[PDB]
């Protein structure tokens, strides 16, 4: 009982008001050759939401390195956005460098299917991953009660950019796939003639005509992805509530 | 665009044909006191999809530990499901123990919004996480070209059940949150009287009246969650393609 | 190009979330035999809106003495309402004791015609004066750029309650009408026989059969109303920006 | 409910018949560089309405000083308007110099939402404040039983023109605001960069980055506005009923 | 064009506000066994309308003698109707004893088709003659520029009443018809047998089987009708403007 | 339950078949600069209708003098109209010189609202007075049972023509008006400035600024209008039945 | 309760995905001058369907000899088609050289009416015989439980082609018709003149003017058709499951 | 395009007129425990149609043996049917013993989709095979130019009845299937547990878990079905045209 944009569609044309000013999505980021992650949170001055903004801010340099920008969204006003960011910088010691959309009539929220049954008034924890052509590539809907794993958003963007450059599909749990490890998958043949040719070429390691792979990702690309998952797995050496 | 079910809605009533028989969802899992993860893949005998089925099968006991059942979905028929499972058992040495829905007219696909612009004929990589009351708790839409991180699906279910059983919300990147670590968040006050009572009480560690937390998770709960992430971050010991 | 509820209509039945809790309008006030003033402001942490909250708070006991409750309204969340009130108490030294409705999807705003062409997202400065029978008695629409004169809101409610108890209409600028001063107007005759009877009864001061008046308001009633206007007219002895 | 035009919309284009002739609204005042106040009353030869006409007439020069024209409205005919004006001059000694719209089919009444539930036949006491560009700036709906405070209408137009002149918003109860007195408010920053640039310039008195103000109003502007309210607050020297 | 109620239809049920009070049409007159003449005029304090009201008032006793009540209608208010009657009594020396409907939104006017293309806002000079069963017997539409001949309204009600009691049709120009004088017409036969049986019976004077008549009206009936027409033809002995 | 054309509307364009041939209304009379009176009767060989045709025929020259043509209408055929005229000439000694519309399907009757509740099959006694511009000036609907007073139709056309030529409105019962006798009324002023100018000009006899008149009709115009009413009031010199 | 395309209609324009690539029907075959038999089967890895694909593959050269291509259809994906063909080749020793449409959303099935009541999800056993102009010539619907007689499809195509080149209709059970054996039927006369002429010209053997025939089919054409039926009648010497 | 009833649906309820009288379909045959073959032909006294009727008549005993009744259909009237049957008996020496539906407004034809683009007026050569429960089991649409192979209609009802009786599916070209000969197919498993159980029971000859078969048909069943085909393949002994 709700409506979304879909993977492979252009992010819907819209003007949004952020605490950084007015911008056109996805044009603002397409014009810069950037990907963007648009994510939502229910309200300013909410605790899970605060832990997420801090997690994104900590990973901001990692997103920037991938050519990826971040843009938040809640139904709160720009004035609440700025007060909350000031609260976070003051009490947690973390500056939030990226804009937050203000969506008080829920116009953006209804366009993106961010209003679920869990709340009539407040957005769930949506994630739109949009590439530099302004095309939606991945969509996640986390609930109110559960913070995102931001390292998985880095892994998704890194794996998509690698798959796009190297003309490969990405196995489950890459770069630690149980069958092929850091291998990447050759898109399968679409005809009997191609299936025959691929097999009788011996160009790739294969389990069958429809399951071929190689290992074309650079050590640097693989170690960058492994770094995100290592950070997700390791307990942080110091907690930020300690000097708050 | 397209239409979807929403977080907090009852998974829609439907009878489906699987390679284990005909079942009503969600009724079939509710009656066993079980959560289910329903996930979709484009087609049988596709390589990324095969890696995902193998990843789910390795983690089958981890899902059963949480009282979670797995059910797959593609537009292929039962006969194709059974032959693809026999192929994975014979060639990779992995038995797929969970059922797969056969959805040849895309009836289930259209109901769950699993047909995106990337393909008019084959589902993307949808994930519906459904609790023992038949309520949709989380929805993920991964694309054709990118395998899922199955350990994040385990982390989501674990954290959702933890939040339900302790009346807590779960911070970003839990149990390795950068502010509060393995801490869990008390739902914030919703009135000025509750906010006052909270600031006067001293019961919780707190950054403000809206940001309180404690550490009520068992070490077992925390370390099991962290183990999912350590497994995602770990280079596999032996690649299944070799033993194949 | 907008719609409204009308004077003489029952305030529309609605459930609203305030920073004090959930209430039904107009029932929650009708139940108590109380009038309410519902007023709106564009957003929390806006300066004209802050001056108006401080003006209502200073007049709170004046409202309480007439049996009139106050309830604010904006499209911000409850958490922004509590933080804004905290800010006003800390920086201006004034407790806002009355509730504010949180209307993030604009549901209440659209119902009360509070969204004008001046902002698609934020409410203008509306005022609904609602009697103890739940009937809209008066409606004011001030713009973004102009704070209300809260003493005129007191005069309106006092004048309405007097007209109700004494069965009189209230002249322009009462209690300082240039024609009849503190006099109150007998509703005019509706028939020729009623007109002739009124005139030949000599019961009232008259300028014509359609313009009769007396002075049935007590000295206290008149003095209460005159104090509202003297306060509006007088520069306050100390400005609150001193200590602030 | 019923329909209205809205603050920030152009007053609706309309030809109206007045006791002074046929005029186009708002063009007839826009082309003179005049603001106008259009106000409604239920019927000619009604007592409250008569008090309000006399109130407006006594303040006629105050409106002319501000470059504001007055235009009345009821469902009565021109002939009745002229007879009622004659009666007021003869019995009260006050000439009504401004036009009255004759609206016998309620055509203008329905366009401006002046028919409320209190009467299906006669307009309530509507007030439309229209600027010299023809834009609706403020709307007031007083009921049948309650005369308007005309000095507040003067205060509104004066404060609006002052805000437009000096690019300021006007605080509650101006020029006797309890926080900043006769101070006028700088419209708040809309971006984090403007918020920071504002606070660092030290250009204004500030309570916070969103609450800045200065005292740019002339002593004349301030005392004119206070004079309106002192007149509202002063018991009249001589009641005009005495001299009939 | 426009639409109307019709001869032989029941006058439409309506509650109307008059300067004598609220009444229900036609019930108010039916319940008394009285005919009524409802007539409209564009506006109070118009000159042709005034002459028509004085003409009706002069003929009031002639109407009452027939068991016929008068009721007027304009889009003016009750207050204007009472002032207009005051004017006529003071300046012409004539009392208007019959009620005038106040129709300010033109609801009655629209129902009776009294708004013609001569004016969007004021009724023409309609006349509805309604019998004691509440049935529309005759309808006249005079224009703004032309006063009615009120003696023809008397002729119509007297002839219709005569026709009803004597079971006769009334010739052109009765009682001065050029063929049969004060003769009244027997309704013509509806069948060949009735036609033959009327010629044979020799009961009536006849020009053919379809044209039979007799003289059943009393001398007083005829003289009453003749008196109306003689008054119409005679220039009044003294003009009322002279005596003022 | 009926539709009519309206005073001030152009007579509807139509082609009609008469017993004189096919003509277009109103063009046929406009072309000649003639007024026309279109009148209806229920059916040929009916006795009231025959009295009306004889009355029209005897007044024919009075209509021709005024530049007014006559045209009848019934639902009977041309053949019936010719046989009916032959009968009247033979049995009554009166030639009918004007045409009669034949309206067998009631096409014209329905267009002019001539079919009332009194009969679903035959027209009532309608009268359309149409000026030389083809504009409907007056409409009368007499019933089946009551013949018209043809002299009032002459008086209407005469008074209308005189009103048009002299730019005057015609009082009740003109030229025998009880207030101003043969006086004609100046249209009332439309503005306060016109009211005052007219009153201080002394140009007209006046009861008030809205009630001015003079005597600009020739004695010939006045005596001709009065002669119509004298004839209406005269007992006929000899009845046509006696030679008939 | 289903819709089909019809004999004599052009096969509907559609782009289809086969395990040989993407083709446009009927264009792909028309541009080659080829007939095509489009046949459907419920699903890959079903036993009746397998028997039918082997029967078609065994007759592939008989189809090729007639200039007829074969194209299959099921709701299975291309990868399943290729895996199923590998299985047939490996286990039955028969290569399927013709393409199979993949119709996973049943788009083609619904267009062609191939979804009957026996299954909502899987196509019945449809056969469309389409000529070299792209016109549907014959449609067969066999059910799930009954394999087709593929020699009758060869007989149909052979008889239609023969009927096309010789301008003849083909009797029941041709080439073994019990009345005229291998004779072909002259289309009957359409007029009485053609009937008389046919019968007197004595050009053909005849039973009546509507039943003429000759023997224009070549010895080779007849024997080819007889060979199809002899193969259908004869049990194979060795069954393929025995060399399996 | 056209509409059709479907395999697995009840034959639609209809009353039809035949040359044997009125009957209800399918109830007429259901109530006897009889299958029926309803077939259509364009028109009586057409040559292909005649050959087909003669083929059905000669095979009537084979249909009667199987408990199958025959019923024809064309748009011709009953009289034409009887004249046509008389002609066949006289000129060909063959009695048609089964009824023919007369369908002159093509009511039955439209309901069964028997009017294709080949003729707007005459049906094509449709065949409905309906079982004793009144269910459509098979549908064939042969065109105008091509006679049916009646022996294939016998093979279909024989194979269907055998399949119903032995709970088996029938392979292509049965009883001469090139893989399993006169073997009949066990419906494949629908679950993995059923698949495994079947492969372990060793109860059936198998090519795979989805392809099991046995030989449960009597030698008489097999040889009767094979005889149908031998008859189709046999050059006839004596052509009936010779003795005609
Ligand atoms: C800052 C902000 O959110 C704002 C400012 C003016 C009006 C409404 C909202
Ligand atoms: C096994 C399977 O998918 C199947 C079986 C019979 C019919 C259709 C599909
Ligand atoms: C406090 C508040 O406004 C809130 C709390 C939880 C979720 C959304 C908003
Ligand atoms: C003066 C006035 O109101 C008027 C005049 C003519 C007709 C109607 C109204
Ligand atoms: C008297 C009259 O017409 C009136 C009175 C009150 C309100 C409106 C009209
Ligand atoms: C004369 C007449 O009315 C007529 C003539 C022919 C047909 C119909 C009507
Ligand atoms: C296997 C097949 O046909 C396919 C391949 C890639 C994606 C979807 C289906
Ligand atoms: C001849 C036949 O079928 C028939 C009989 C009577 C009426 C119409 C048709």
Curated annotation (Swiss-Prot), chains A, B, C, D, E, F, G, H:
Span of domain Thioredoxin: 5-162
Entry GO terms, CC: cytosol
Enzyme class, UniProt record, top EC level: oxidoreductase
Residue ranges the record marks as coiled coil: none
PROSITE patterns for the chain: THIOREDOXIN_2
Pfam families: 1-cysPrx_C, AhpC-TSA
MF-aspect GO terms: antioxidant activity; identical protein binding; peroxiredoxin activity; thioredoxin peroxidase activity
Amino-acid positions noted as binding substrate in the UniProt annotation, renumbered to this chain: 125
Other comment: The active site is a conserved redox-active cysteine residue, the peroxidatic cysteine (C(P)), which makes the nucleophilic attack on the peroxide substrate. The peroxide oxidizes the C(P)-SH to cysteine sulfenic acid (C(P)-SOH), which then reacts with another cysteine residue, the resolving cysteine (C(R)), to form a disulfide bridge. The disulfide is subsequently reduced by an appropriate electron donor to complete the catalytic cycle.
Role of this protein: Thiol-specific peroxidase that catalyzes the reduction of hydrogen peroxide and organic hydroperoxides to water and alcohols, respectively. Plays a role in cell protection against oxidative stress by detoxifying peroxides.
Stated family: Belongs to the peroxiredoxin family. Prx6 subfamily.
Full protein name: Peroxiredoxin
Organism: Aeropyrum pernix (strain ATCC 700893 / DSM 11879 / JCM 9820 / NBRC 100138 / K1)
């Amino acid at each position: 009982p709700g409506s979304i944009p879909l993977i492979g569609e252009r992010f819907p044309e819209m003007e949004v008001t952020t605490d950084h000013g007015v911008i056109k999505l996805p044009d603002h980021y397409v014009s810069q050759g950037k990907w963007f992650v648009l994510f939502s949170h229910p309200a300013d001055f909410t605790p899970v939401s605060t832990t997420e903004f801090v997690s994104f801010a900590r990973r901001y340099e990692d997103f920037q390195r991938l050519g990826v920008d971040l843009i938040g969204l809640s139904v709160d006003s720009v004035c609440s956005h700025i007060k909350w960011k000031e609260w976070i910088e003051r009490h947690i010691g973390v500056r939030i460098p990226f804009p937050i959309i203000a969506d008080p009539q829920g116009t953006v929220a209804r366009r993106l299917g961010l209003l679920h049954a869990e709340s009539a008034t407040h957005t769930v924890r949506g994630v739109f991953i949009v590439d530099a052509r302004g095309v939606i590539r991945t969509m996640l809907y986390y609930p109110m009660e559960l913070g995102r794993l931001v390292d998985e958003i880095l892994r998704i963007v890194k794996a998509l950019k690698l798959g796009d450059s190297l003309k490969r599909a990405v196995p489950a749990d890459w770069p630690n796939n149980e069958i092929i490890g850091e291998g990447l998958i050759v898109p399968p043949p679409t005809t009997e003639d191609q299936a025959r040719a691929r097999m009788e070429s011996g160009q790739y390691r294969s389990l069958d005509w429809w399951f071929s792979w190689d290992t074309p990702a650079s050590r640097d690309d693989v170690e960058e992805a492994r770094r995100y998952l290592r950070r997700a797995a390791e307990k942080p050496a110091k907690l930020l509530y300690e000097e708050a």
